[PDB]
Structure 1
Amino acid sequence: SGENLYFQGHMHEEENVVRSNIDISKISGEWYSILLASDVKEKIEENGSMRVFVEHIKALDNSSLSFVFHTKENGKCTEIFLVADKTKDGVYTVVYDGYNVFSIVETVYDEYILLHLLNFDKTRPFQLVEFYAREPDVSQKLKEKFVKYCQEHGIVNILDLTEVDRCLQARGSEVA
């Protein structure tokens, strides 16, 4: 006798984690910048060009993606509008502080996006890893996931943005 037990689920571990065949409509909407990492720490510390705080992602056509960010310039939150062009599933290019490529590494559409960017500056090229979430903070488990990804890629300058000025106060342009 005893309770018969039965395997349930799939063999791989993660639930609803999307790594390819990205559905753009479901990654659209409101996002918050949570974590930022780089191999060049100056790019993400205060005054760094890549210290940008995402606001919204929108599908533009069957290819391109609109990204709206805030960044700090001359003491103020300023809104910056970017259009990223698709080169293949999950991969885009965009011009900002030079020429960039970036990849949607992994996403849970209603929770988070992990993005890995390369910038091709001739003198000081760099990599950026970003973690966006559907809320302004995330679980410790997800922060550890991000940190492990960074470590696996040799990226050791890792900032948690959730207790510093991310220009949240600048997101109130539109009312219900």
Structure 2
Amino acid sequence: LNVEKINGEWFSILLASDKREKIEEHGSMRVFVEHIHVLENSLAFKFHTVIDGECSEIFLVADKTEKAGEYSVMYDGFNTFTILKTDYDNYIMFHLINEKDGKTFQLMELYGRKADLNSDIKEKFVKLCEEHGIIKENIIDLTKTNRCLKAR
């Protein structure tokens, strides 16, 4: 991975978790990326989220950990994540582990450089989720939800 090439604007496409409530409509992880800015030791993210039906912004900075390719950020507990796959110019797939109260769950996300991705890429992401124990029923196609596109 050449992490500088993930810089810029992205859209949240598919959102998946082995703890489904976290990504349901009022869940803390139901967030919609707008950009990723690559810094020397970190990644700076801007997201939107819906709070009581209203779009709202979330800004996070994730720092490199001592494990190559891994980043950490505090948000509803302690999160670590990695980049599983990307072609830089169309898609990126993230894998995240949240810890809170000594309990963990996984989050996987598919972002696109455009507001949608084709079925081939989506199905490949679904299979990768299943490879992590994230079942098909726990993958949400955010293009059929409020992603706060109007707020971008």
The yes-or-no answer on 1:122 pairing with 2:101 is yes
**Aligned partner letter, 2:146:** D
- Identity, in percent, stands at 61
Q: Quote the offset at 1:63 in angstroms.
A: 1.2
After superposing on structure 2, the runs of 4+ consecutive aligned residues of structure 1 that deviate more than 3 Å are none
- TM-score, with length taken from structure 1: 0.82
Unaligned runs of 5+ in 1: 1-21, 172-176
Deviation per CA, 1:120-169: give whole Å up to 9, x if none. 11265211000001000001000100110011111011111112110000
Larger strand share, 1 or 2: 2
**Aligned partner letter, 1:149:** L
Larger helix share, 1 or 2: 2
Q: Distance in 2 between matches of 1:45 and 1:124?
A: 19
Q: Distance in 2 between matches of 1:114 and 1:125?
A: 20
- TM-score, with length taken from structure 2: 0.94
Partner secondary structure for residue 66 of structure 1: strand
Q: Distance in 2 between matches of 1:78 and 1:123?
A: 29
Q: Distance in 2 between matches of 1:115 and 1:134?
A: 14
Aligned residues: 149
Alignment of 1:37-52 (within 5 A): 37-52=16-31
Deviation per CA, 1:37-81: give whole Å up to 9, x if none. 000110001101000000000012x11110000011122111111
Structure showing greater radius of gyration is: 1
Conserved in 2, the CA contact under 8 Å of 1:90 and 1:105?
Answer: no
Q: Distance in 1 between matches of 2:87 and 2:97?
A: 22
Please report the RMSD computed on the Cα atoms of aligned residues, expressed in angstroms. 1.1
